């Protein structure tokens, strides 16, 4: 459980808040020696948002791995962190003061924005339900529909760092109901952060959870490059990898021409995604050996996704599945010799996969395993019809006598009395 | 059929009448059949009430059948050796093993054309190609395969090429199908009449 091909350098450069140190510490702790580095970056960002629990957790782990490397040859300092904690709690009480000042002001505008700013610094102490209820209450200060709009907006934005999807998608639906998101012109002529696209991003990564990756890349291509930028938490690298890979694991070539070979809004992401692009090109090529080669070369950071890690191999599955669906699509028989000559992979176990596929996959085909070749079965209309015909005939006839005897058991009034 | 009818028949009690109906029924479902029969349509309540919770025997039966474990096979065998013995009905374990080889073979059937019996000795548990020789013996023997003895290599090529009903005798197979279903509908009409014959109001 270690994996080197991820760049949280630029991410923690720009992508921030909760998920910054979230992916940092997490993907660290599933990748030692970058556990080292990703925990170091979480360290560096603890100077913002001011939470120290897992901060000093990583202090401990620091001394641990230090001695683990200082075996022959650690001090993540937190005492001045303690004094700064004191100062920050002072500032928190300042914030409570301003809060209640604004309460006494008794203004939907002002008290709502107070909820906002208080939650904003609840960021700056690792304070979740605090900011949570702040914005949840700021909800109900409707002197304008801007209140409802920006409420759902920034609450979902909080959940962004929060790693909150599904009822944050309830936020999505609620905001999408009343004040007509996208303003009939792409939030009035270039919705820059395409709010509806951020809604789709919430839905699509919640479905990364819930496994809707056709729908995922669907909304991802739906996600355009209007903003061209989103430094808060979600990278164009994020959504672009999302769309391209959910597509290449879920979509068909036809949906490519429909959508990908006609991908422009994501074509910005397409140029952003050189190598997912190139793997879809190998799809076009069916360079299955080199295609899955480049796939599992990407596989390092692919697993390195905190979201793709749970799904990266499943997508590899779907990839080679659809791929070799394509592969044996043209053929009435696969010379397994010439097959592996195409693949350059031991089709012993590949074959075993294939036999499963006979069980499940697209295999309308046969193999003299003495021959070591596949032989696509021709789809029978006539005698398969005969098959099903007399099958259902025997079923119906058995059930004929069966229902006769059930009419008997019910007319005969027989029941097995318990005593 | 017998035991599914007897069980879906109205009932309230438990019985090794019913318990062993359960027994031979699901033995059919797994030993005879490819794998687990599904729950019948108008099954009795008290089974789920009484005998279905009593059915741990074949809960573990269908379980181990899914498992494909010969060791756990014999373990469950020692478990229910009572029922193994109870009515001259020993050998049920060999029956389940027969169903095992059924699963293995039938599996390999549509998946292959011809295979190494020692390799398929790993596949079906053919016990080496030579015990698999007697097995292929069964294949061409027990009405088991469209295939013959390629004894040059002992090869066994699946065909499944019985009929397009392409002989009129198969057409008369259909004809006796027809006979059954026609008289069936006729008695359906007669009984439909008779419910009409019911004293109405």
Q: Which of A196, A237, A197 is nearest to A220 (CA)?
A: A197
Number of H helices, E strands in chain B: 10, 0
Write down the experimental method used for this entry: cryo-EM
**Residue contact A366–B164, C-beta within 8 A:** no
Q: Which residues contact B134 (CB under 8 A, 6 or more apart)?
A: none
Q: In the beta sheet, which residues pair with residue A375? A: A366
* Phi and psi based region of residue A180 (left: phi greater than 0; alpha: psi -120 to 50; beta: remaining): left
The beta-carbon neighbor of B9 closest among A382, A383, A414 is A414
Nearest CA in chain B to A381: B164
**Where does residue B117 rank: exposed (0-12), middle (13-18), buried (19+ CB within 10 A)?**
buried
How many other C-beta atoms are found inside a 10 Å radius of the C-beta of residue B1? 12
Backbone dihedral angles phi then psi of residue B155, each to the nearest 5 degrees: -85, 150
**Residue contact B10–A370, C-beta within 8 A:** no
Q: Are B189 and B182 in contact (CB under 8 A)?
A: no
Q: What angle do CA B134, B136, B140 make, to 5 degrees?
A: 115
Distance CA(B156)–CA(B140), nearest Å, equals 9
Q: Which of B3, B11, B94 is nearest to B48 (CA)?
A: B11
Q: Which of A201, A286, A187 is nearest to A237 (CA)?
A: A201
**Residue contact B10–A414, C-beta within 8 A:** yes
In chain A, residues preceding a discontinuity (C to N beyond 2.5 A) are 73
Distance CA(A63)–CA(A82), nearest Å, equals 18
Min Cα separation B78/chain A (Å)? 30
A403 vs B: CB within 8 A: no
Cβ-based contacts of A402 with chain B (< 8 Å): 1, 4-5
How many other C-beta atoms are found inside a 10 Å radius of the C-beta of residue B99? 20
Alpha-carbon Rg for chain B in angstroms = 22
**Where does residue A91 rank: exposed (0-12), middle (13-18), buried (19+ CB within 10 A)?**
middle
- Tokens matching residue A347: 């089709």
Min Cα separation A58/chain B (Å)? 45
Distance CA(B122)–CA(B116), nearest Å, equals 10
Distance CA(A370)–CA(B114), nearest Å, equals 5
* Interchain CB contacts (distance < 8 Å): A and B: 90
**Residue contact B113–A369, C-beta within 8 A:** yes
B2 vs A: CB within 8 A: no
């Amino acid at each position: 459980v270690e994996n080197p091909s991820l760049d949280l350098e630029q991410y923690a450069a720009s992508y921030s808040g909760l998920m910054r140190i979230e992916r940092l510490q997490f993907i660290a702790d599933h990748c030692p020696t970058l556990r080292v580095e990703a925990l170091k970056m979480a360290l560096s960002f603890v100077q913002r948002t001011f939470n120290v629990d897992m901060y000093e957790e990583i202090h401990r782990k620091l001394s641990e791995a230090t001695r683990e490397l200082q075996n022959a040859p650690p001090a993540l300092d937190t005492a001045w962190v303690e004094a700064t904690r004191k100062k920050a709690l002072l500032k928190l009480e300042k914030l409570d003061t301003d809060l209640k000042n604004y309460k006494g002001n008794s203004i939907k505008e002002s008290i709502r924005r107070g909820h906002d700013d208080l939650g904003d610094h609840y960021l700056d102490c690792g304070d979740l339900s605090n900011a949570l209820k702040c914005y949840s209450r700021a909800r109900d200060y409707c002197t304008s529909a801007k209140h409802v709009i920006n409420m759902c907006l920034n609450v979902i934005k909080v959940s962004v760092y929060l790693q909150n999807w599904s009822h944050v998608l309830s936020y999505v639906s609620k905001a999408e109901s009343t004040p007509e998101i996208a303003e009939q012109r792409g939030e009035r002529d270039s919705q820059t952060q395409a709010i509806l696209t951020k809604l789709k991003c919430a839905a699509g990564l919640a479905e990364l959870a819930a496994r809707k990756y056709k729908q995922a890349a669907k909304c991802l291509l739906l996600a355009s490059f209007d903003h061209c930028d989103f430094p808060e938490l979600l990278s164009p690298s994020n959504v672009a990898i999302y769309g391209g890979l959910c597509a290449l694991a879920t979509f068909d070539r036809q949906e490519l021409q429909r959508n990908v070979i006609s991908s422009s809004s994501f074509k910005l992401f397409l140029e952003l995604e050189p190598q997912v692009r190139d793997i879809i090109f190998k799809f076009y090529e069916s360079k299955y050996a080199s295609c899955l080669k480049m796939l599992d070369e990407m596989k390092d950071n692919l697993l390195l996704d905190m979201y793709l890690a749970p799904h990266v191999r499943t997508l590899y599955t779907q990839i080679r599945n659809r791929a070799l669906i394509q592969y044996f699509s043209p053929y009435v028989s696969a010379d397994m010799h010439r097959m592996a000559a195409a693949f350059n992979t031991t089709v012993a176990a590949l074959e075993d996969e294939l036999t499963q596929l006979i069980l499940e996959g697209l295999i309308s085909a046969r193999v003299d395993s003495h021959s070591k070749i596949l032989y696509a079965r021709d789809v029978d209309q006539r005698s398969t019809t005969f098959e099903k015909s007399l099958l259902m005939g025997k079923e119906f006839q058995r059930r004929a006598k069966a229902m006769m005897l059930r009419a008997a058991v019910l007319r005969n009034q027989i029941h097995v009395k318990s005593p | 059929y017998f035991y599914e009818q007897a069980i879906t028949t109205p009932a309230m009690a438990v019985s090794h009448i019913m318990l062993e109906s359960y027994k031979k029924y699901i033995l059919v479902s797994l030993i005879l059949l490819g794998k687990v029969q599904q729950l019948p349509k108008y099954t009795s309540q008290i089974v789920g009430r009484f005998i279905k919770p009593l059915s741990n025997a074949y809960h573990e039966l269908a379980q181990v059948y899914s498992t494909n474990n010969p060791s756990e096979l014999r373990n469950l065998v020692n478990k229910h050796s009572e029922t193994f013995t109870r009515d001259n009905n020993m050998g049920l374990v060999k029956q389940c093993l027969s169903s095992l080889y059924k699963k293995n073979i039938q599996r390999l059937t549509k998946t292959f054309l011809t295979l190494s019996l020692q390799d398929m000795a790993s596949r079906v548990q053919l016990s080496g190609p030579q015990e698999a020789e007697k097995y292929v013996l069964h294949m061409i023997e027990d009405g088991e395969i469209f295939a013959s003895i390629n004894q040059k290599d002992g090869m066994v090529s699946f065909h499944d090429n019985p009929e397009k009903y392409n002989n009129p005798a198969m057409l008369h197979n259909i004809d006796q199908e027809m006979l059954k279903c026609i008289e069936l509908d006729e008695r359906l009409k007669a009984m439909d009449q008779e419910i009409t014959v019911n004293p109405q109001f």
